[PDB]
């Protein structure tokens, strides 16, 4: 039970970090950010979490990219 408790406190700390990354309002609430960048030009990113956290905005701007480099991976 102590072993179960310690593990539930680690999963609670992980879910606390997920909750700190999650929307404080609903999925459709729709707020939209524009990021000014050098060469005085714009990008755009959706979601209320991105408005306040510059690091989340740039992480989201990379997450949305639809390319992936092909990986390479490896008897009786």
């Amino acid at each position: 039970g102590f072993e179960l408790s310690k593990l539930l406190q680690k999963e609670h700390q992980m879910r606390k970090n997920v909750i700190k990354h999650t929307s404080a309002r609903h999925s459709r609430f729709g707020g939209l950010l524009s990021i000014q960048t050098p060469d005085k030009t714009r990008l755009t990113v959706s979601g209320s979490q991105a408005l306040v956290d510059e690091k989340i905005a740039l992480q989201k701007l990379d997450d949305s990219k639809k390319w992936n480099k092909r990986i390479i991976k490896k008897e009786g």
Partner: protein, 345 residues
């Protein structure tokens, strides 16, 4: 398949007659140019619709015929096919609209920012060591007002007199408004943001339904072969107020043993909520087919449904002193009573 024919119309002439009309025309016979002064109210944002009186274009053609220069019968074009001329008058207005003279407080509007960022991005790209659909920036609604009797837009029709031969024409229809929709936004121009290239693209809608874009096609997205994703933004879309109404013919007009027929009226833009149920009204409007779209268009066949785009509306039907003008006659109680239902003795 697609043959072609010699019609006695040239929209390059008539576009020149329309722009020549707008800049020149003044009703100085009422004693600067009427539509220029009107457009100044539009450019200052003090006005949101342009009413074109067809009865003016007669005075234009009359003055030009009196000057011996044969103006190209323009009223007989715009009664006979009104729909296309809503496009020509908007092009002729935009080419002539004056710069604002009052301050707008410009940066309160979204499109002033979006289109400026789009301007600057094109300069900073094109340094390299239409621009967008014009309907997006039209802050005004155009309407024609028909001929008064002084010709087919003059004679008001019962709903059954509106034969299929009238489609495309400017007509006037007489009846009761029998029911009215709540006002809903129709789209006209849909703005999308690309997530990756950060670039705005516009779809223009001219049908009961449309298909969304989803995949980016900006120069800098396709040049970088980046499969950018498009998301719709209502903040930068252009909507118009849309309200659908139904009109029925008057009991005097229905021939003996028939049933009162009806038309759908579509009212768009500033003309909205000018109609109320139980009004007896003359609506002048552009009679049109509403084409079925998608699968229903195949199975419905050639049998087009139909509607009327409203253009202008004619309803069929001193205070503080007039109460003293009663009181100072005297005996008000007995005279007011005798004045309830005077036909009953």
């Amino acid at each position: 398949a697609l043959p072609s024919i010699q019609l006695p119309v040239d929209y390059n002439n008539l576009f020149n007659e329309i722009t020549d009309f707008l800049v020149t025309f003044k009703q100085d016979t009422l004693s600067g140019p009427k539509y220029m002064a009107m457009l100044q109210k539009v450019a200052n944002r003090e006005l949101n619709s342009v009413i074109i009186d067809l009865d003016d274009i007669l005075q234009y053609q009359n003055e030009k015929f009196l000057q011996g220069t044969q103006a190209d019968d323009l009223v007989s074009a715009i009664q006979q096919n009104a729909n296309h001329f809503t496009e020509l008058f908007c092009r002729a207005i935009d080419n002539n609209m004056p710069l604002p003279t009052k301050e707008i407080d410009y940066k309160d509007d979204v499109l002033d920012v979006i289109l400026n960022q789009r301007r600057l991005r094109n300069e900073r790209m094109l340094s390299d060591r239409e621009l967008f659909p014009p309907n997006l920036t039209r802050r005004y609604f155009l309407y024609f007002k028909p001929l008064s009797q002084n010709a087919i837009s003059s004679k008001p029709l019962s709903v059954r007199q509106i034969k299929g031969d009238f489609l495309g024409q400017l007509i006037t229809v007489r009846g009761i408004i029998t029911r009215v929709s709540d006002v809903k936004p129709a789209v006209e121009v849909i703005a999308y943001t690309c997530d990756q290239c950060g670039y705005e693209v516009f779809q223009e809608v001219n049908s009961r339904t449309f298909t969304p874009l989803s995949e980016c096609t900006s120069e800098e997205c396709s040049q970088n072969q980046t499969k950018g994703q498009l998301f719709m933004s209502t903040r930068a879309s252009k909507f118009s107020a849309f309200q659908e109404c139904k009109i029925q013919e008057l009991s005097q007009q229905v021939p003996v043993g028939h049933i009162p027929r009806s038309l759908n009226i579509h009212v768009n833009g500033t003309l909205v909520r000018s109609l109320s149920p139980g009004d007896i009204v003359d609506v002048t409007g552009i009679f049109l087919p509403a084409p079925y779209t998608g699968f229903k268009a195949l199975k419905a066949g050639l049998l087009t449904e139909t509607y009327l785009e409203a253009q202008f509306v004619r309803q069929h039907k001193d205070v503080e002193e007039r109460v003293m003008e009663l009181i100072t006659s005297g005996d008000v109680y007995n005279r007011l009573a005798k004045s309830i239902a005077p036909e009953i003795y």
